[PDB]
Design an enzyme around this catalytic site. Structure first.
Site, mmCIF file in Angstrom:
data_model
loop_
_atom_site.group_PDB
_atom_site.id
_atom_site.type_symbol
_atom_site.label_atom_id
_atom_site.label_comp_id
_atom_site.label_asym_id
_atom_site.label_seq_id
_atom_site.Cartn_x
_atom_site.Cartn_y
_atom_site.Cartn_z
ATOM 1 N N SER A 156 0.826 -1.205 0.000
ATOM 2 C CA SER A 156 0.000 0.000 0.000
ATOM 3 C C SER A 156 0.864 1.260 0.000
ATOM 4 O O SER A 156 1.704 1.430 -0.882
ATOM 5 C CB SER A 156 -0.949 -0.016 1.196
ATOM 6 O OG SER A 156 -1.960 0.952 1.035
ATOM 7 N N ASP A 208 -8.292 -4.140 -7.056
ATOM 8 C CA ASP A 208 -7.795 -3.431 -5.888
ATOM 9 C C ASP A 208 -7.868 -1.917 -6.151
ATOM 10 O O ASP A 208 -7.393 -1.441 -7.177
ATOM 11 C CB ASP A 208 -6.362 -3.916 -5.600
ATOM 12 C CG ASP A 208 -5.717 -3.249 -4.387
ATOM 13 O OD1 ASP A 208 -6.369 -2.445 -3.681
ATOM 14 O OD2 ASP A 208 -4.527 -3.535 -4.144
ATOM 15 N N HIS A 235 -7.461 -5.348 -1.623
ATOM 16 C CA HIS A 235 -6.212 -4.709 -1.263
ATOM 17 C C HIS A 235 -5.539 -5.444 -0.112
ATOM 18 O O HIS A 235 -4.335 -5.296 0.131
ATOM 19 C CB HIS A 235 -6.486 -3.266 -0.846
ATOM 20 C CG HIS A 235 -5.252 -2.468 -0.567
ATOM 21 N ND1 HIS A 235 -4.287 -2.235 -1.522
ATOM 22 C CD2 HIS A 235 -4.836 -1.833 0.556
ATOM 23 C CE1 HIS A 235 -3.321 -1.502 -0.993
ATOM 24 N NE2 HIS A 235 -3.636 -1.235 0.263
#
Ligand SMILES: O=Cc1ccc([N+](=O)[O-])cc1
Ligand SMILES: O=Cc1ccc([N+](=O)[O-])cc1
Lengths: 269, 269
Positions: free
Chosen positions: B146, B201, B258
């Site tokens: 991320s 995602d 994600h």
């Protein structure tokens, strides 16, 4: 170690249990198809599965869950959510016992679990009877994880013996009463309870035996690790009230193992 | 579609990435074996892998992560940690850009990622430099999930070409800057970047193309579902700056997608 038919049932109802956490909006109408966020209940989504009744913070115990018609797998399913915050619920877990001589001829169960349910038994008994009438050939099944496990187990033992079989699938449920209740849950007619546990999950180790609590027999123990996919060879049947060699080992317990029952459970991505 | 080896490398650095969140780091002195809770990084645990330098809330960027030595795999791994709560990191995500000619000419990167890295650049270069000296035989590897993935790509873009190669493995990392930076990262020798995405995602889609942003090539895209195991066949190599067909496709994005890169990542059981 158990049948594939059994594995399929265990996976199916584990996903029904997870839907009690991740099935968007308890403020939903009756009739609409059942769906989950973050892939929590794919096998439930695959099937013609709709809500019949949804309940939230209901009663004195703040009970939550749904009643579902499944027209594919031919089931009627009462599903209980567990705690929105397991860590807390675990630490805050009261160990007091209460007499349950309605359900059980000489049994003490957990005061909180017994009371939360007893406060909603009436309404929920009605909702199920209306379905059982509308679908006489449909399997009535009670299911839940963590707190929901226990609640399902208590509803199951309290509502059995009325003409229709009630089967109970519980997932990481905690001990729900004393030695006698354990025996009544072992031999009771009008269904089968499948009490599923996962590795060194902490919850089916509480309240401790050291407090008068005892486990019904048998236990279906999942040996495969946390975040590991489950196969029918990873589940071992364990006979005997308070048996060892399953979830009931002297080793160090674990919270994550509680949140992985066939797939993610008790929390939502 | 990817080699068994590359697959193993992807899985390894996914777990170093998740170790950034679920590790027992900070007040975890140098030489400490790296372990994660909730089975978040078994492969990392299996290896002779130790902390060289932990950091939490370092500099203006609240930058968290660790520097790890891996005698088993012969690595110096600088794992960057994403946000403590992703949904709020997303809704607050600033799209502003600043100049970065220190990395490449005419380049601009997300003002925020580039500021956060700068505020810690000198310090972390030193620690990497020390470890490159003690273990020059060891392959330097920068990884992150991320926001962590973002820092890594910008860190390794900045620190390359000082003797040692720096590989980058990133997991659902957002776009980092303008086109001129995308092209740079795609070609910059002295370390390969492996930019990894999972299905639909949301993160690798922000900041959006329309705000001056562009993704590097190639993209390794994971076809398999959220909470599904990944096999070599579920990964696809996607060529071309800003190519569509991988993550960059016109459907609803997903936060849960994600959180599943080979396993649970960005959250801890
Ligand atoms: O909000 C979390 C929550 C915790 C415990 C309980 N309970 O035990 O009833 C219900 C909800
Ligand atoms: O606590 C979460 C968090 C969110 C954003 C950031 N940041 O990028 O500054 C850092 C931490």
């Amino acid at each position: 170690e158990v049948s594939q038919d059994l594995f399929n049932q265990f996976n199916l109802f584990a996903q029904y249990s997870a839907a009690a956490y991740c099935g968007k909006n308890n403020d939903a109408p009756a009739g609409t198809n059942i769906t989950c966020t973050g892939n929590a209940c794919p096998e439930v989504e695959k099937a013609d599965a709709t809500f019949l009744y949804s309940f939230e913070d209901s009663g004195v115990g703040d009970v939550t869950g749904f009643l579902a018609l499944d027209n594919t797998n031919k089931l009627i399913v009462l599903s209980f959510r567990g705690s929105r915050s397991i860590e807390n619920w675990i630490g805050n877990l009261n160990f007091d016992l209460k007499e349950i001589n309605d359900i059980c001829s000489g049994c003490r169960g957990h005061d909180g679990f017994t009371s939360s349910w007893r406060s909603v038994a009436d309404t929920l008994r009605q909702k199920v009877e209306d379905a059982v009438r509308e679908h006489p050939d449909y399997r009535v099944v009670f299911t839940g994880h963590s707190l929901g496990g226990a609640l399902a187990t208590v509803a199951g033992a309290d509502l059995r013996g009325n003409g229709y079989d009630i089967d109970v699938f519980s997932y990481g449920a905690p001990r729900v009463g004393n030695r006698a209740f354990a025996e009544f849950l072992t031999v009771q007619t009008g269904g089968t309870l499948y009490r599923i546990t996962h590795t060194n999950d902490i919850v089916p180790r509480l309240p401790p035996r050291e407090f008068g609590y005892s486990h019904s027999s048998p236990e279906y123990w999942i040996k495969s690790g946390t975040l590991v996919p489950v196969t029918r060879n990873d589940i071992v049947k364990i006979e005997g009230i308070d048996a060892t060699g399953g979830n009931n080992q002297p080793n160090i317990p674990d919270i994550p193992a509680h949140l992985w029952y066939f797939g993610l459970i008790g929390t939502c991505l």
